[PDB]
Amino acid sequence: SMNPPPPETSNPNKPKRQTNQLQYLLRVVLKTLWKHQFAWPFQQPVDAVKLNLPDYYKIIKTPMDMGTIKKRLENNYYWNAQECIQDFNTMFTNCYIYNKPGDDIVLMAEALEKLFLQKINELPT
């Protein structure tokens, strides 16, 4: 099909360890973006088949979405906060490199990214 397998969300050989920053990323950053009214197109991998975007996965080499990020956090997949922040950045980058500037989806991503950056600027050190 046009769709790859979804990204892995668990890391079985990784030991489970909580950190203040990972708690913040799940319970402040992800939670705030997830509840936002513009979150829904980002809550699951892009279905290029059903959306009829045949070139999506030609352009996007590293698929990423907030559902994957949520499950990675809930499964303690990330070793540190920077890995999680990278996934958020990749999700936004994908939207901005595939869609045309000013598209509704781009406006929705920009609103979410502003909120993300606002919350990331209060991440505990």
Ligand X SMILES: Cn1cc(-c2ccc(C(=O)Nc3ccccc3N)nc2)c2cc[nH]c2c1=O
5 vs 15 by CB, closer to ligand X: 5
3-state DSSP assignment of residue 26: helix
Span from 20-28, 40-48, 72-80, 82-90 in contact with ligand X (CB under 6 A): 40-48
Instruction: Establish if 112 lies at the interface with ligand X (CB under 6 A).
Output: no
What number of helices (H) and strands (E) belong to the chain? 7, 0
Contact between 69 and ligand X by CB under 6 A: the answer reads: no
Q: Output the furthest CA–CA distance in the chain (Å, rounded).
A: 43
Q: What is the dihedral of CA 106, 10, 75, 23, to 10 degrees?
A: -60
Contact with ligand X (CB under 6 A): which of 22, 39, 95, 112? 95
Number of residues that bind ligand X (CB under 6 A): 9
Site membership for ligand X, residue 111 (CB under 6 A):
no
84 lies in the site for ligand X, by CB under 6 A: no
In degrees to the nearest 10, what's the CA dihedral of 4, 92, 43, 121?
140
Q: Does 46 bind ligand X (CB under 6 A)?
A: yes
The residues binding ligand X (CB under 6 A) are 41-42, 46, 51, 53, 95, 98-99, 105
